[PDB]
Design a protein around this ligand. Structure first.
Ligand SMILES: CCc1nc2ccn(Cc3ccccc3)c(=O)c2n1[C@H]1CCc2cc(-c3ccccc3-c3nnn[nH]3)ccc21
Lengths: 16, 251
């Protein structure tokens, strides 16, 4: 989802 | 057999994803170092090397943010989670994350207080209840939930499955593929039943009571969201953490 940038990034790349 | 490997798989991932477990928390609370006890404004000031209502609330937010990251890492390890549609992965996290945080907060609590700052402190239930107007009501329902939930006497291996059951709820709003979620959840529910029958052979009706607590969590989470909106109407330009703003944005 584009409306959930952080959730999407956490799911796609993990925590930086 | 396939259901035990699933339990063993979930336990390992729960230990990799969650640094402070129910076993670690209970070892500290039972009387075996020693956490600083915060029971008033004086003791708080004393133990500051380990507005107060707002400073404590920001800690609640920051720890809630870290828990969302831990839960997201754990979710990925749930067999089948990653191959569900990406929008469904978002929805499951967005709706289930506050239920898990509530469940896992019970692991750090007793009827008198909560383990804080990685187990270095212990903030009393009476000190949190003593906070000004809205903030004083923040923790009390979490304490009331923990008391009834901790009496179920689940350990980390039991909880690892329960958390997986919660994430995979096929009834969250806006899900695109209900069936694949419900199917994973039936496997997880079976696994849970078998874990509780082997881990608590004396404890009949435990899976039953646990499913009731699971239903209760929905009502318990709406009440917490209702309380968060009261904070926004009272407090000004303060705002919530970008990630929390994102989870709470249009539920
Ligand atoms: C670690 C204790 C704790 N975990 C959580 C997780 C989510 N939410 C919120 C929530 C959201 C949804 C459902 C239920 C609860 C919390 O309110 C929460 N808490 C509270 C208990 C009292 C407390 C104190 C502090 C704190 C205060 C001063 C100094 C340090 C800390 C601290 N930092 N890191 N750990 N402790 C931080 C968090 C918390």
């Amino acid at each position: 989802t584009e409306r959930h940038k952080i959730l999407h990034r956490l799911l796609q790349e993990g925590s930086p | 057999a396939d259901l035990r490997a699933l339990a063993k798989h979930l336990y390992d991932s729960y230990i990799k994803s969650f640094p402070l477990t129910k076993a670690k928390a209970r070892a500290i609370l039972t009387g075996k170092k020693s956490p600083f006890v915060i029971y008033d404004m004086n003791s708080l000031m004393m133990g500051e090397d380990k507005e107060v209502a707002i400073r404590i609330f920001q800690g609640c937010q920051f720890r809630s943010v870290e828990a969302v990251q831990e839960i997201t890492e754990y979710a990925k390890s749930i067999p089948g989670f990653v191959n569900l549609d990406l929008n469904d992965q978002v929805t499951l996290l967005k709706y289930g994350v506050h239920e898990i945080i509530y469940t896992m907060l019970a692991s750090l609590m007793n009827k008198d207080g909560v383990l804080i700052s990685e187990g270095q402190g212990f903030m009393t239930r009476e000190f949190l209840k003593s906070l000004r107007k809205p903030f004083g009501d923040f923790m009390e329902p979490k304490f009331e939930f923990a008391v009834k939930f901790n009496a179920l006497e689940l350990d980390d291996s039991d909880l690892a499955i329960f958390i997986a059951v919660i994430i995979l709820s096929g009834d969250r709003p806006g899900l695109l593929n209900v069936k694949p979620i419900e199917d994973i959840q039936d496997n997880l529910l079976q696994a849970l039943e078998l874990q509780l029958k082997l881990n608590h052979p004396e404890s009949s009706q435990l899976f039953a009571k646990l499913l009731q607590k699971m239903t209760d969590l929905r009502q318990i989470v709406t009440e917490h969201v209702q309380l968060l909106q009261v904070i926004k109407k009272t407090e000004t330009d303060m705002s919530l953490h970008p990630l929390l703003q994102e989870i709470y944005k249009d539920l």
